Structure 1
Amino acid sequence: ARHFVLNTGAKIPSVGLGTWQSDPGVVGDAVYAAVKAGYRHIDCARVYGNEKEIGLALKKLFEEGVVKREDLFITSKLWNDHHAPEDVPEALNESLKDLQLDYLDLYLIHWPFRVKKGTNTSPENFITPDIPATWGAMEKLYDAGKARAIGVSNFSSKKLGDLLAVARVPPAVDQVECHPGWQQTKLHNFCQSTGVHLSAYSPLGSPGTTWMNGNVLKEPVIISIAEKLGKTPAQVALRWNIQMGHSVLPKSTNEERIKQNLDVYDWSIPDDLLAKFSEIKQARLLRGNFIVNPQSVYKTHEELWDGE
Structure 2
Amino acid sequence: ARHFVLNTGAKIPSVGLGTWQSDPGVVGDAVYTAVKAGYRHIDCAKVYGNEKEIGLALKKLFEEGVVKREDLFITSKLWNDRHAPEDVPEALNESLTDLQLDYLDLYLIHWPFRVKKGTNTSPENFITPDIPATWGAMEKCYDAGKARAIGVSNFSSKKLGDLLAVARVHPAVDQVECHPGWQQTKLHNFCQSTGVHLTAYSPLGSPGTTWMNGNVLKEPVIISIAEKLGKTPAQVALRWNIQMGHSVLPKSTNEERIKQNLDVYDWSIPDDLLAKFSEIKQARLLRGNFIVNPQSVYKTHEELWDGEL
* TM-score w.r.t. length of structure 2: 0.99
For 2:9 and 2:144, how far apart are their aligned partners in 1? 17
Deviations 1:194-223 (A, max 9, x none): 000000000000110000011000101001
| Residue aligned with 1:42, SS | strand
* Cα offset, 1:262, TM superposition: 0.5
* Cα offset, 1:49, TM superposition: 1.0
Aligned positions of 1:118-137 closer than 5 A: 118-137=118-137
Deviations 1:30-72 (A, max 9, x none): 0011000110000000011110000000000000000000000
* Cα offset, 1:270, TM superposition: 0.3
For 2:195 and 2:161, how far apart are their aligned partners in 1? 12
* Cα offset, 1:25, TM superposition: 1.1
For 2:194 and 2:25, how far apart are their aligned partners in 1? 40
Aligned positions of 1:69-218 closer than 5 A: 69-218=69-218
For 1:74 and 1:104, how far apart are their aligned partners in 2? 6
* Cα offset, 1:123, TM superposition: 0.4
For 1:296 and 1:75, how far apart are their aligned partners in 2? 28
Aligned positions of 1:228-247 closer than 5 A: 228-247=228-247
| Residue aligned with 1:84, SS | coil
For 2:236 and 2:145, how far apart are their aligned partners in 1? 36
Contact conserved, 1:24 with 1:49, CA < 8 A, in 2? no
* Cα offset, 1:19, TM superposition: 0.2
For 1:188 and 1:213, how far apart are their aligned partners in 2? 24
* Cα offset, 1:24, TM superposition: 2.7
Deviations 1:264-290 (A, max 9, x none): 001110000100001000000000000
| Residue aligned with 1:278, SS | helix
For 2:140 and 2:34, how far apart are their aligned partners in 1? 32
* Cα offset, 1:163, TM superposition: 0.3
For 2:249 and 2:11, how far apart are their aligned partners in 1? 15
| Residue aligned with 1:211, SS | helix
Deviations 1:226-260 (A, max 9, x none): 01100000000000000000000000011100000
Q: Which runs of structure 1 show a deviation greater than 2 angstroms over 4 or more consecutive aligned residues?
A: none
Deviations 1:103-137 (A, max 9, x none): 00000000000000000000010000000000000
| Residue aligned with 1:290, SS | helix
For 1:232 and 1:48, how far apart are their aligned partners in 2? 29
| Residue aligned with 1:117, SS | coil
- Equivalent residue number for residue 283 of structure 2: 283
| Residue aligned with 2:277, SS | coil
Deviations 1:139-179 (A, max 9, x none): 00000110000000000000000000000100000000000
Contact conserved, 1:41 with 1:72, CA < 8 A, in 2? yes
Structure 2 spans left out of the alignment, 5+ residues: none
* TM-score w.r.t. length of structure 1: 1.00
Deviations 1:51-99 (A, max 9, x none): 0000000000000000000000000000000000010011101100110
